[PDB]
Amino acid sequence: FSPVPSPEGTKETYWETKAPSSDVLGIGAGVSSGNFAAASVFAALVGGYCTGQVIPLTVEPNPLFLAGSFLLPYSWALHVAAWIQKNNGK
Amino acid sequence: DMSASVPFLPRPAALDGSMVGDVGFDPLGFTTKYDIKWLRESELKHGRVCMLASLGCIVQEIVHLPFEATSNPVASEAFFQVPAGGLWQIFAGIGIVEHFSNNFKMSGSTMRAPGNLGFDPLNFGKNPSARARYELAEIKNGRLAMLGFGGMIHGCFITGKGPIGALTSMDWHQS
Amino acid sequence: MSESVPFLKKPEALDSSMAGYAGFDPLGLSSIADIKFLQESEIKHCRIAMLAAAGSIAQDIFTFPGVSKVVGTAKMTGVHDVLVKQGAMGQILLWTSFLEVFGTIALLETLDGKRAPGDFKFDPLGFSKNAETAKRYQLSEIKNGRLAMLATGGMVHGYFITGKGPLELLTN
Numbered sequence: 263f264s265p266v267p268s269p270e271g272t273k274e275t276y277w278e279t280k281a282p283s284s285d286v287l288g289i290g291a292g293v294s295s296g297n298f299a300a301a302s303v304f305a306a307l308v309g310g311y312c313t314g315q316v317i318p319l320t321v322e323p324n325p326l327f328l329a330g331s332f333l334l335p336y337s338w339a340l341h342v343a344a345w346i347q348k349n350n351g352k
Numbered sequence: 353d354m355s356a357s358v359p360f361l362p363r364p365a366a367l368d369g370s371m372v373g374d375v376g377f378d379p380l381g382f383t384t385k386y387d388i389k390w391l392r393e394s395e396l397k398h399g400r401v402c403m404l405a406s407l408g409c410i411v412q413e414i415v416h417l418p419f420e421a422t423s424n425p426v427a428s429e430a431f432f433q434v435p436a437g438g439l440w441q442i443f444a445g446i447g448i449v450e451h452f453s454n455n456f457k458m459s460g461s462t463m464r465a466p467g468n469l470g471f472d473p474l475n476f477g478k479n480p481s482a483r484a485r486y487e488l489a490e491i492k493n494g495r496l497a498m499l500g501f502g503g504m505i506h507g508c509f510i511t512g513k514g515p516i517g518a519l520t521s522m523d524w525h526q527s
Numbered sequence: 528m529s530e531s532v533p534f535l536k537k538p539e540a541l542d543s544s545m546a547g548y549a550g551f552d553p554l555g556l557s558s559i560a561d562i563k564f565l566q567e568s569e570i571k572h573c574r575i576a577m578l579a580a581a582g583s584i585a586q587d588i589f590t591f592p593g594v595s596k597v598v599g600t601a602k603m604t605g606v607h608d609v610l611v612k613q614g615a616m617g618q619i620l621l622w623t624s625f626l627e628v629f630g631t632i633a634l635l636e637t638l639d640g641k642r643a644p645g646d647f648k649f650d651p652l653g654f655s656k657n658a659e660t661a662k663r664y665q666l667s668e669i670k671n672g673r674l675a676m677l678a679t680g681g682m683v684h685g686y687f688i689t690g691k692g693p694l695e696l697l698t699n
């Protein structure tokens with residue numbers, strides 16, 4: 263009804279292809295699919311290991327293991343980015 | 353193009369080396385959000401209050417009016433160690449003199465050179481160039497007096513002595 | 528292809544002109560972040576690291592008047608804990624925070640394409656007035672700074688094992 267503002271750098275992200283354009287990856291638009299796939303596997307193993315090392319949680323835990331356990335959900339987004347880049351020829 | 357005070361930052365577009373005190377020193381972009389006439393008159397008012405306050409704090413320890421409850425040298429403590437009513441009367445005096453001085457104006461309404469409120473009964477500014485030089489003197493001593501008065505009043509919170517007393521006996525042999 | 532790493536491809540973001548270029552970016556991190564941000568970040572890490580390695584050596588060489596009486600034994604990172612009880616660190620923190628505030632403004636101006644990475648125009652002595660000798664001092668700053676990051680990490684970690692401190696650990 264009036265112009266709706268969006269921040270500078272807003273681009274068109276609607277896709278009807280097999281995979282979205284690499285622009286949907288933001289700052290990761292230039293990373294290759296091999297690098298996302300290897301980072302995804304790495305993050306999944308390190309995140310699962312760190313998660314496993316602190317499943318009995320105690321009042322004093324190792325702080326690095328806590329931070330490293332956040333790599334398991336991050337790996338899901340990494341392998342989705344690997345599928346997007348492999349189907350974009352990157 | 354580049355600020356004189358800060359070589360790497362660009363010059364604040366607003367200043368243009370026109371007002372006295374313009375060494376291009378506005379890194380945080382405060383002139384873009386407010387009018388500079390209001391800011392300059394505010395700067396002059398803060399510096400004038402701080403000049404009066406610095407001189408007052410200095411002399412309180414050295415010389416006090418010889419009456420009971422006016423003998424506490426430490427400025428900070430002298431606020432509490434004094435009749436509340438008398439200082440309250442001074443606060444009320446600060447109100448009327450201001451309303452009359454600025455002709456009864458707000459932030460937009462105040463703008464008349466900024467800070468030129470007319471209270472110069474003696475003819476010091478004979479030469480207009482001597483007036484400009486005295487303006488540079490006023491702003492620089494006002495800036496010094498702002499930092500200086502802040503520095504002594506926080507010394508007085510730390511040392512508990514007063515300006516000259518804190519300077520003369522500064523504990524070199526401990527923290 | 529890349530110079531430093533012959534099997535790997537030349538980094539896209541990196542350029543020959545960018546001082547201290549060896550074509551070294553195997554993981555392609557320069558593609559992820561803005562290259563000017565990484566350049567400013569590397570230059571800043573270089574300068575902090577240079578100061579820290581020099582400080583580590585100097586702390587083993589001598590001690591400013593009165594410091595022996597606040598801290599007796601602690602040499603590298605132990606001194607920081609005693610000084611935070613005092614005002615020594617808080618003071619450095621406050622003034623460096625103030626200096627970094629204008630560093631933040633400088634970063635914003637750089638990221639819009641105007642200022643150059645690490646260029647704060649701080650050249651009082653006449654050391655860069657040639658623009659060929661200037662290029663050599665820029666590259667020397669980056670190489671000494673990179674060496675200093677590795678060194679500072681090396682010295683602090685050696686103190687973590689032994690507690691000796693850098694030069695005394697060299698002696699014993």
Ligand code: CLA
Pocket residue numbers: 401404405407408409411412415416417421422423424425430431434438439446449
């Ligand atoms: C921000 C300013 C400021 C503030 C809040 C105070 C506040 C105080 N002072 Mg200090 N004082 C100041 C400035 C200030 N003074 C200045 C500038 C001087 C002159 C150097 C003094 C000299 C002074 C003495 C000698 C004594 C106080 C005392 C006091 C206390 C009681 C008030 C009193 O009797 O005043 C008395 C004020 C005077 C005798 C002189 C004031 C003259 C003015 C402010 C300076 C000249 C200004 C100029 C002509 C134009 C003014 C315009 C203005 C009216 C808007 C109170 C805590 C008394 C106290 O309890 O001390 C512990 C005391 O004995 N003051």
Ligand code: CLA
Pocket residue numbers: 575578579581582583585586587589590591594598601602606607610615626647649
């Ligand atoms: C990252 C840097 C860093 C840090 C955090 C510290 C921190 C400390 N040092 Mg180490 N030190 C440093 C650098 C550093 N120093 C450097 C560069 C040297 C000289 C080569 C030293 C030499 C040294 C000795 C010999 C001793 C300390 C000591 C101390 C402690 C007391 C605080 C003090 O008085 O230091 C004061 C430190 C200095 C004054 C040196 C700072 C010099 C740099 C070059 C400052 C330059 C500012 C720069 C020119 C401004 C540029 C402006 C531009 C950005 C526009 C504290 C742990 C004492 C201690 O506890 O050790 C047991 C001690 O005895 N330091």
Ligand SMILES: CC1=C(C#C/C(C)=C/C=C/C(C)=C/C=C/C=C(C)/C=C/C=C(C)/C=C/C2=C(C)CCCC2(C)C)C(C)(C)C[C@H](O)C1
Pocket residue numbers: 603604605607608676677679680681683
């Ligand atoms: C914690 C703590 C504090 C502190 C503190 C400080 C100052 C902590 C500083 C920590 C630093 C700077 C660590 C850096 C380590 C460097 C590493 C791991 C590089 C390894 C190089 C590798 C793997 C490969 C290198 C490579 C090789 C060999 C081959 C190719 C070349 C290259 C790529 C170079 C305090 C002061 C608050 C006190 C408090 O009580 C305790």
